[PDB]
Amino acid sequence: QCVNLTTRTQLPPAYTNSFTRGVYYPDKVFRSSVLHSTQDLFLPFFSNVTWFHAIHKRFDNPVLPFNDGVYFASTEKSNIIRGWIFGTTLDSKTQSLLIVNNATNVVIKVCEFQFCNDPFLGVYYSEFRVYSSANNCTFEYVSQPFLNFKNLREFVFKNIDGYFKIYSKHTPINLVRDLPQGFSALEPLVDLPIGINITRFQTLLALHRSGWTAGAAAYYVGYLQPRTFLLKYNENGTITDAVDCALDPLSE
Amino acid sequence: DSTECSNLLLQYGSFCTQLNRALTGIAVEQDKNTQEVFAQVKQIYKTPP
Amino acid sequence: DSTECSNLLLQYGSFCTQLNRALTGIAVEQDKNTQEVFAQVKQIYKTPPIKDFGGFNFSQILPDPSKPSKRSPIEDLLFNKVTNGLTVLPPLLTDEMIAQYTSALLAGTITSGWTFGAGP
Amino acid sequence: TKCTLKSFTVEKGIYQTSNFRVQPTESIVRFPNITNLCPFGEVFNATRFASVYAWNRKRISNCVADYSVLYNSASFSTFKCYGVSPTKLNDLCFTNVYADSFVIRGDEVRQIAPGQTGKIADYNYKLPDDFTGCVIAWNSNNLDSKVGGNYNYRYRLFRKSNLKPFERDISTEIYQAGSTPCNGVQGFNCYFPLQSYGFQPTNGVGYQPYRVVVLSFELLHAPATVCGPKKSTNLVKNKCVNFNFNGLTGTGVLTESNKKFLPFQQFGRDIADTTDAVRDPQTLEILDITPCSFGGVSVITPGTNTSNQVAVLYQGVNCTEVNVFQTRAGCLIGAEHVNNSYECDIPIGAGICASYQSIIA
Amino acid sequence: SALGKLQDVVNQNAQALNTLVKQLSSNFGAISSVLNDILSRLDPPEAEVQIDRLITGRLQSLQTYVTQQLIRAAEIRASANLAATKMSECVLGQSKRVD
Amino acid sequence: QIDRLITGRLQSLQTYVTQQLIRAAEIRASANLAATKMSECVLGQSKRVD
Ligand SMILES: *[C@@H]1O[C@H](CO)[C@@H](O[C@@H]2O[C@H](CO)[C@@H](O)[C@H](O)[C@H]2NC(C)=O)[C@H](O)[C@H]1NC(C)=O
Ligand SMILES: *[C@@H]1O[C@H](CO)[C@@H](O[C@@H]2O[C@H](CO)[C@@H](O)[C@H](O)[C@H]2NC(C)=O)[C@H](O)[C@H]1NC(C)=O
Ligand SMILES: *[C@@H]1O[C@H](CO)[C@@H](O)[C@H](O)[C@H]1NC(C)=O
Ligand SMILES: *[C@@H]1O[C@H](CO)[C@@H](O)[C@H](O)[C@H]1NC(C)=O
Ligand SMILES: *[C@@H]1O[C@H](CO)[C@@H](O)[C@H](O)[C@H]1NC(C)=O
Ligand SMILES: *[C@@H]1O[C@H](CO)[C@@H](O)[C@H](O)[C@H]1NC(C)=O
Ligand SMILES: *[C@@H]1O[C@H](CO)[C@@H](O)[C@H](O)[C@H]1NC(C)=O
Ligand SMILES: *[C@@H]1O[C@H](CO)[C@@H](O)[C@H](O)[C@H]1NC(C)=O
Ligand SMILES: *[C@@H]1O[C@H](CO)[C@@H](O)[C@H](O)[C@H]1NC(C)=O
């Protein structure tokens, strides 16, 4: 089942500042009270991060590139954002990745989904229209639920050597509109052995029905580049500060 | 300007950093030597006409 | 702890002995330097209990009896302001004995002037 | 001391002769508590394999793997391993195993190697230059041959570019070897990319069907899943033991650590880039690896003209791990400690000196 | 920054020790920088080559460290001789030497 | 071949830096002597013979 959404309002996507967000733990090694220099796929400091809205009539589900990696920020309240779609052609010709977080659990499936043009979820005030078929499935993984704007969700999606690394951080905030300025190191959430080609990704949202109404939410998409960071590990093994080695001569 | 040469040179580690640091120490040592020898007065005196 | 690595290392000869000899020479040279700088007096002089020096105050440079380290306030400030087969050998003269040597030199130069450096 | 100084007369003083390090006592192997065997049988003893252009990859994780079953059995003509020893594979732990099975001819068995060229290496199956694993090839004449020709095993003969390592290509498009477009029809200068082996049992040993399984081991930084059949021993602490924690080998003293590991972290490391903390695979306990007591042995002696009595100093070693006297410089054996103070004759260190009067300190 | 000379000497010695320890993390062209991994992964014919590469790299690093240690020892010896001269001439007597 | 050139040039550069350090120590000793002569012979009258 597929449904066209024909009540959208045309608006260009916005841009804002990354500040000092997007830092994740580069490896699974404990380090304490040290300054460690690492070269990895990181989000540059103070970069131009793309801003998408969900407000009522805005419903931003565009076609975005994946490139090397994706930083996904979410200023979320009342749980509209439910999952992501990864793939290359997003049809039955190639194999695609489904990540969903419904009311019970988080489901990861690697199948050849025949995706709809407008994949979405729905809340009645009981609606699931994402794909029409799933024929060849190789990987399944059922896990715990991962999840004024009250909640900040940071995720980092990387695909190296057939491994999909998802890094996550949950932050209590009270800022109304933009990204708060500060530092928060993203802990690794899951490592998935999907082994598939990913060049395009989709955000999955949830409708609110009595047509449809979009709940208030906002998300941000940034792109990772290979660069060097100097990370500071405190006495408790937590990354408390970082330096972008190629940003400006002071940090260099 | 050979990138393959630099890629092979990266196998040897931080030798270049040590050589640059030693030369920098020598270079600041020369200025320190001149400062100790000649700058022994903080008043610039002149002879009478 | 690899025996095969040491067996292969024995092909290079007495390089390890040379490096250990050089490090031992440096280590004894540091103790010789400390002896040359601080151990210039064979008498441990002490100040009199009454600090009557004609108005001159030496409390900031004489050792403090209240402190367990027996250091001067200036020396205490100086000590506060300075912060896989490797071993650190302790120095032959400890910090309290070096402080005792400096205290002896201070007592000699206060109570006797330059006379203690040339004789009795 | 006489042998070290290369002289029969030793002057008065202290001389560094050798180094002391405490030997390990026990050996402690800690592997995860898994029992289920991963299907090497379904990889090797399958009824029908796949062709080399569509080579079959099976992911292997979370198992005990007995590699000496594959090694010692007299069934594989080639068991040639790259980057690891075949006999040592029982004593190692890997995060993931890729088993890539296909069928080729005998003369193409050589082409399954890093840094080699041919039709299979360029167009069908490419191995990276940093390959760590084994290549296991055995003859399959009774299974893969038939009188009149077995044409169900095809290899890719034509491609525009060479394959990347571990890239699978199953596309069937007509190769344009000339200027004329092919439009999906074979003909002049337009060939099908897949070419049949055409196996017969009367063929030569070069044209003979060999089944090849390539095992590649992910040794990268990750939790280890595939482990050998080595049995786990009980944990002993506060002693110098050799340890094998999930394939990580070392020698040290395992103690309790106050380091609060995050739950995704297995190892610990410091500014010296040394593994000083590990997570126990079984109890999920974080253990501090303090390396064991060591130091130098110094022989304190007077002149051989005076006396032949000697004392030994173990530098930076406490006296309980070796006339016993504990100094800050180390443990001193053979010299009696006195409460009287004299001038320094033989320097020991940390305010301690030695003299001869017996040897006193 | 009053006590910069002593802190400079302490920092130089600590940095030399840190560099010498850090040089163990380099493989010097071998497959790994850990000797136990090579001894547990490879047969002795190729482990001999890998251990030989590690030995020559670490020996070059150690000789370099000893060379700068000897140079710094000479510098510290000159400074200590100057300090002994100042102790003899300024503390134990009155000096006519200007500055 | 490039590795042979790299190790030869690196050995040459290490030799150059080592001899430069030795000459720097010698020049530092000479400069300390010159500063002592500046303080004691120019800024005052010295009783030291020669
Ligand atoms: C929702 O809209 C999309 C695009 O507006 C529809 O996709 C097209 O559907 C027609 C009819 O089947 C095809 O001829 C086009 O080729 C499709 N476009 C693309 C790019 O593939 C989609 O069918 C609509 N959904 C429903 C349920 O009608
Ligand atoms: C010498 O100097 C010390 C320190 O300046 C004097 O000690 C001070 O004495 C006053 C009055 O007794 C106290 O209020 C201060 O707290 C003391 N300071 C310290 C650091 O002890 C001392 O009085 C001076 N004179 C003599 C003869 O020692
Ligand atoms: C971000 O990009 C848009 C267009 O791509 C540009 O107009 C805007 O100025 C950029 N912002 C920053 C901070 O660079
Ligand atoms: C991944 O997909 C893109 C486009 O879908 C393609 O250009 C690229 O070659 C693919 N890579 C692999 C390894 O299949
Ligand atoms: C969530 O999804 C899983 C699998 O897709 C399903 O088993 C479960 O019933 C779903 N829960 C709800 C509340 O829809
Ligand atoms: C994928 O699914 C299609 C249709 O369900 C089937 O024809 C095809 O063989 C499948 N591919 C694999 C590799 O199983
Ligand atoms: C580290 O953890 C301890 C709790 O044991 C806490 O008291 C301390 O503040 C923490 N350090 C930092 C920098 O947060
Ligand atoms: C395959 O089957 C034979 C039966 O004779 C057995 O001996 C052999 O061990 C099996 N191979 C594997 C890998 O299990
Ligand atoms: C097996 O290992 C788990 C850790 O995943 C541990 O909780 C459990 O107690 C172990 N069981 C036995 C019998 O050792």
**A230 — phi, psi (to 5°)?**
-105, 110
Instruction: Tell me the pairing of strands D240-245 and D27-30.
Output: parallel
Q: Report the Cα B26 to chain-centroid distance in Å.
A: 5
User: Which residues, numbered 1 to 49 in chain B, qualify as contacts with chain E under a Cβ-Cβ cut-off of 8 Å?
Assistant: 11-14, 18, 40
Helix axes E44-86, F2-37, angle to 10 degrees: 10
User: Which residues, numbered 236 to 295 in chain D, qualify as contacts with chain A under a Cβ-Cβ cut-off of 8 Å?
Assistant: 259-262, 264-271, 277
Query: What CA–CA distances, in Å, run from D180 to D158, D184, D185, D216, F36?
Result: 16, 12, 11, 42, 90
Q: In whole angstroms, give the CA distance from residue A31 to residue D273.
A: 9
**D242 — phi, psi (to 5°)?**
-70, 140
Chain position carrying tokens 């940390």: D350
Q: Report the Cα D250 to chain-centroid distance in Å.
A: 12
Minimal C-alpha gap between A191 and chain D (Å): 9
Query: Pick from A216, A155, A159: which is nearest to A186 by CA?
Result: A155
Site from C29, C41, C89 to mutate, D interface, most D CB atoms within 10 angstroms: C89
**D117 — phi, psi (to 5°)?**
-125, 165
Q: Are D67 and D89 in contact (CB under 8 A)?
A: yes
Using the beta-carbon criterion (under 8 Å), do B12 and E28 form an inter-chain contact? Answer: yes
Beta bridge partners of D249: D244
Q: Return the structure tokens found at D274.
A: 């040394």
Instruction: Tell me the pairing of strands A217-223 and A48-55.
Output: antiparallel
Q: Return the structure tokens found at A39.
A: 């070269």
Cβ neighbors of A197 (< 8 A, separation 6 or more) are: A87, A88, A94
Q: In whole angstroms, give the CA distance from residue A200 to residue A205.
A: 17
Q: In whole angstroms, give the CA distance from residue D103 to residue A199.
A: 32
CATH 2.60.120.960 applies to domain A14-252: yes
Q: In whole angstroms, give the CA distance from residue D198 to residue D153.
A: 7
Radius of gyration of chain A measured on its C-alpha atoms: 18
> Where in A181-224 does DSSP place strands (E)?
187-192, 200-204, 206-209, 213-214, 217-223
Give burial (CB, 10 Å; 0-12/13-18/19+) of D140.
Answer: middle
Q: Point out residues after which chain C has a gap (C–N over 2.5 Å).
A: 83
User: Which residues in chain D are contacts of A32 at CB distance < 8 A?
Assistant: 259, 268, 270
Instruction: Note the residue count of chain F.
Output: 50
Q: Are D149 and D200 in contact (CB under 8 A)?
A: yes
Q: Return the structure tokens found at E33.
A: 């920088």
User: Which residues in chain D are contacts of C89 at CB distance < 8 A?
Assistant: 315, 329, 349
Q: In whole angstroms, give the CA distance from residue D147 to residue D143.
A: 12
Distance A117 CA to ligand 1 centre (A): 7
Chain position carrying tokens 């802190």: E7
Instruction: Note the residue count of chain B.
Output: 49
Query: What CA–CA distances, in Å, run from D137 to A76, C86, D59, D134, D140?
Result: 56, 49, 19, 10, 9
User: Which residues in chain E are contacts of D250 at CB distance < 8 A?
Assistant: 36
Instruction: Tell me the pairing of strands D175-176 and A213-214.
Output: unpaired
Burial pattern E46-70, b for ≥16 Cβ within 10 A else e, equals: ebbebbebbbebbeebbebbbebbe
Q: Give yes or no for D3 touching A (CB within 8 A).
A: no
Name the experimental technique.
cryo-EM
Question: DSSP class of residue D232?
Answer: P
Angle at A28 between CA A24 and CA A34, to 5 degrees: 75
Using the beta-carbon criterion (under 8 Å), do D272 and E40 form an inter-chain contact? Answer: no
Q: Is D262 helix (H, G, I), strand (E, B) or coil?
A: coil
Number of other residues whose CB lies within 10 A of the CB of residue D356? 18
Q: Resolution, rounded to a tenth of an Å? A: 3.2
Chain position carrying tokens 């009188």: D147
Distance A141 CA to ligand 4 centre (A): 25
DSSP code per residue over chain E:
-TTHHHHHHHHHHHHHHHHHHHGGG--TTSS-S-HHHHHHHS-HHHHHHHHHHHHHHHHHHHHHHHHHHHHHHHHHHHHHHHHHHHIIIIISS---S--
Site from D60, D269, D286 to mutate, A interface, most A CB atoms within 10 angstroms: D269
Minimal C-alpha gap between F44 and chain E (Å): 6
Q: Return the structure tokens found at D184.
A: 């999906």
Using the beta-carbon criterion (under 8 Å), do C19 and E63 form an inter-chain contact? Answer: yes
Query: Pick from A129, A70, A73, A71: which is nearest to A100 by CA?
Result: A129
Q: Return the structure tokens found at C119.
A: 């004789």
Q: Are D163 and D180 in contact (CB under 8 A)?
A: no
Q: Is A63 helix (H, G, I), strand (E, B) or coil?
A: coil
Domain chopping of chain A, boundaries: 14-252
Q: Which ligand is nearest to the CA of A16?
A: 3
Work out how many CB contacts closer than 8 A connect C with E.
Answer: 85
Rounded to whole angstroms, the maximal C-alpha distance in chain B is 67
Q: Return the structure tokens found at D340.
A: 């009287």
Q: In whole angstroms, give the CA distance from residue D294 to residue D318.
A: 10
Distance D207 CA to ligand 2 centre (A): 103
Q: Are E28 and E54 in contact (CB under 8 A)?
A: yes
Using the beta-carbon criterion (under 8 Å), do D349 and C1 form an inter-chain contact? Answer: no
Residue in F3, F24, F34 closest to B29 by CB: F24
Q: Is D123 helix (H, G, I), strand (E, B) or coil?
A: helix
**Amino acid at the residue B10:** L
* First-residue to last-residue Cα distance in chain B: 59
Residues of E in CB contact (< 8 Å) with C are 2-3, 6-7, 10, 17, 20-21, 24, 35-36, 39, 44, 47-48, 51-52, 54-55, 59, 62-63, 66, 69-70, 73, 76-77, 80-81, 83-84, 87-88, 91-94
Q: Is A203 helix (H, G, I), strand (E, B) or coil?
A: strand
Burial pattern C7-44, b for ≥16 Cβ within 10 A else e, equals: ebbeeeeeeeeebeebbeebbebbeebbbbbbebeeee
Q: In whole angstroms, give the CA distance from residue D354 to residue D300.
A: 8
Query: Pick from A24, A14, A15: which is nearest to A71 by CA?
Result: A24
Q: Is C22 helix (H, G, I), strand (E, B) or coil?
A: helix
Q: Return the structure tokens found at C72.
A: 């001067």
Burial pattern C58-93, b for ≥16 Cβ within 10 A else e, equals: eeeebbeeeeeebbbeebbeeeeeeeeeeeebbbbb
Query: Pick from D70, D60, D61, D62: which is nearest to D90 by CA?
Result: D70
Query: Pick from A131, A12, A154, A17: which is nearest to A81 by CA?
Result: A154
The answer, yes or no, to whether any atom of ligand 3 lies below 6 A from the CB of A15, is: yes
Query: What CA–CA distances, in Å, run from C75 to A151, C59, C82, D142, D265?
Result: 55, 12, 11, 91, 45
Number of other residues whose CB lies within 10 A of the CB of residue A11? 11
Q: In whole angstroms, give the CA distance from residue D49 to residue D47.
A: 7
Radius of gyration of chain D measured on its C-alpha atoms: 33
Q: Are D316 and D322 in contact (CB under 8 A)?
A: no
Secondary structure of A97-114 as H, E, C letters:
EEEEECCCCEEEEEEEEE
Q: In whole angstroms, give the CA distance from residue E9 to residue E68.
A: 13
Q: Are C74 and C60 in contact (CB under 8 A)?
A: yes
Torsion sign over Cα D146, D148, D151, D152: negative
Torsion sign over Cα D175, D178, D182, D188: negative
Distance A162 CA to ligand 9 centre (A): 30
Using the beta-carbon criterion (under 8 Å), do B37 and F34 form an inter-chain contact? Answer: yes
